[PDB]
Scaffold this motif. Structure first.
Motif, short mmCIF file in Angstrom:
data_model
loop_
_atom_site.label_atom_id
_atom_site.label_comp_id
_atom_site.label_asym_id
_atom_site.label_seq_id
_atom_site.Cartn_x
_atom_site.Cartn_y
_atom_site.Cartn_z
N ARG A 63 0.68 -1.34 -0.10
CA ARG A 63 -0.13 0.04 0.07
C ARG A 63 0.86 1.32 0.08
N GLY A 64 1.86 1.38 -1.06
CA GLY A 64 2.68 2.49 -0.98
C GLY A 64 3.56 2.94 0.15
N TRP A 65 3.90 1.95 0.79
CA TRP A 65 4.67 2.09 1.98
C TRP A 65 4.11 2.40 3.39
N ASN A 66 2.64 2.38 3.34
CA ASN A 66 1.85 2.22 4.29
C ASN A 66 1.73 0.86 4.89
N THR A 67 1.59 0.76 6.08
CA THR A 67 1.38 -0.79 6.78
C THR A 67 0.12 -1.24 6.37
N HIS A 68 0.02 -2.62 6.20
CA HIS A 68 -1.18 -3.29 5.92
C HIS A 68 -1.41 -4.40 6.81
N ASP A 69 -2.51 -4.44 7.44
CA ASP A 69 -2.89 -5.31 8.30
C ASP A 69 -3.10 -6.94 7.69
N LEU A 70 -2.28 -7.84 7.88
CA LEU A 70 -2.44 -9.09 7.49
C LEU A 70 -2.72 -10.20 8.57
N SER A 71 -3.11 -9.83 9.73
CA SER A 71 -3.14 -10.69 10.94
C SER A 71 -4.24 -11.51 10.77
N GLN A 72 -5.58 -11.23 10.05
CA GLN A 72 -6.47 -12.20 9.79
C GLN A 72 -6.16 -13.33 8.67
N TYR A 73 -5.13 -12.98 7.86
CA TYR A 73 -4.69 -13.71 6.71
C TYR A 73 -3.47 -14.93 7.05
N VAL A 74 -2.84 -14.78 8.34
CA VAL A 74 -1.87 -15.63 8.63
C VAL A 74 -2.36 -17.21 8.78
N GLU A 75 -3.38 -17.45 9.66
CA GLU A 75 -4.01 -18.49 10.05
C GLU A 75 -3.92 -19.62 8.63
N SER A 117 0.42 -7.41 11.30
CA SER A 117 -0.60 -6.39 11.44
C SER A 117 0.04 -4.89 10.98
N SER A 118 1.34 -5.16 10.47
CA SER A 118 2.05 -3.91 9.98
C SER A 118 2.93 -4.25 8.95
N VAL A 119 2.38 -5.04 7.94
CA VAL A 119 3.45 -5.20 6.94
C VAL A 119 3.47 -4.35 5.68
N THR A 120 4.48 -3.88 5.31
CA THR A 120 4.72 -2.94 4.18
C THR A 120 4.64 -3.57 2.77
N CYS A 121 5.68 -4.55 2.76
CA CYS A 121 6.43 -4.84 1.66
C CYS A 121 6.55 -6.39 1.48
N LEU A 122 6.44 -6.72 -0.03
CA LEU A 122 6.90 -8.17 -0.43
C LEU A 122 8.40 -7.81 -0.72
N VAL A 123 9.30 -8.83 -0.40
CA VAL A 123 10.80 -8.55 -0.49
C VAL A 123 11.46 -9.59 -1.41
N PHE A 124 12.00 -9.42 -2.54
CA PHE A 124 12.94 -10.43 -3.15
C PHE A 124 14.40 -9.92 -2.56
N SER A 125 15.23 -10.89 -2.41
CA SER A 125 16.81 -10.52 -2.54
C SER A 125 17.89 -11.61 -2.48
N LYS A 126 18.87 -11.27 -2.88
CA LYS A 126 19.96 -12.21 -3.43
C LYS A 126 20.10 -13.60 -2.29
N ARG A 127 20.12 -14.64 -2.90
CA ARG A 127 20.42 -15.93 -2.50
C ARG A 127 22.03 -16.11 -2.84
N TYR A 128 22.13 -16.38 -4.17
CA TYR A 128 23.46 -16.74 -4.77
C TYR A 128 23.82 -15.70 -5.51
N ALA A 129 25.01 -15.55 -6.01
CA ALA A 129 25.68 -14.47 -6.79
C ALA A 129 25.35 -14.57 -8.36
N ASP A 130 24.71 -15.70 -8.62
CA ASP A 130 24.50 -16.12 -10.11
C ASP A 130 23.52 -15.20 -10.96
#
Length: 173
Positions: A62-74, A144-157
């Motif tokens: 949500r454009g850097w705003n936090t989003h409540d995903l607590s009902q979604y974890v279950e 309940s305060s999730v801002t982002c989905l994240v991708f990051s480096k695992r390998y250098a390939d």
């Protein structure tokens, strides 16, 4: 519970980058591919171009705003379609929160490797990642305060993947 769309058809507000510029970005975010489509919509291109080192890609809910995903974890999932340029691509994947009162980490990540949930082929595959596999880690992470989905480096390939219809769903009511 309503779907939380991360990527559908247009550029995603967020920040992507790397130490030397190995990760392909435009306006500090992931490129949208119009030549590679899926289900009649453009795709999101995660493309590291050379070896080197760090890279990261943040896609806001949500454009850097936090989003409540607590009902979604279950029982909720992180759903998306994916294909690689050759197959067996792997990287860190997860979520970032933000809690200003939490002194030991204003933002905490909960992450896994994507190869745990899907072996990537040159064909489209629909993968579902259960939120309970990530958002329950005893990290201090706050669902309940999730801002982002994240991708990051695992390998250098170097690799290239394409994403389609990235969303948070829950079959709970």
């Amino acid at each position: 519970l309503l779907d939380v769309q991360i990527f559908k058809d247009s550029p995603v507000v967020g920040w992507s980058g790397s130490g030397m510029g190995e990760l392909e970005t435009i306006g500090d975010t992931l490129p949208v591919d119009t030549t590679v489509t899926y289900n009649g919509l453009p795709t999101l291109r995660l493309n590291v171009q050379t070896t080197v080192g760090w890279w990261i890609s943040l896609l806001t809910l949500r454009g850097w705003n936090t989003h409540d995903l607590s009902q979604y974890v279950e029982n909720g999932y992180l759903e998306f379609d994916i294909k690689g340029k050759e197959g067996g691509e792997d990287f860190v994947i997860g979520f970032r929160d933000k809690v200003y009162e939490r002194v030991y980490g204003l933002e905490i990540d909960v992450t896994t490797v994507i190869s745990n949930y899907v072996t990537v082929t040159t064909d489209w595959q629909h993968v579902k990642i259960p939120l309970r596999d990530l958002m329950k880690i005893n990290n201090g992470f706050d669902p309940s305060s999730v801002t982002c989905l994240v991708f990051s480096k695992r390998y250098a390939d170097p690799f290239t993947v394409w994403f389609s219809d990235i969303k948070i769903t829950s079959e709970d009511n």
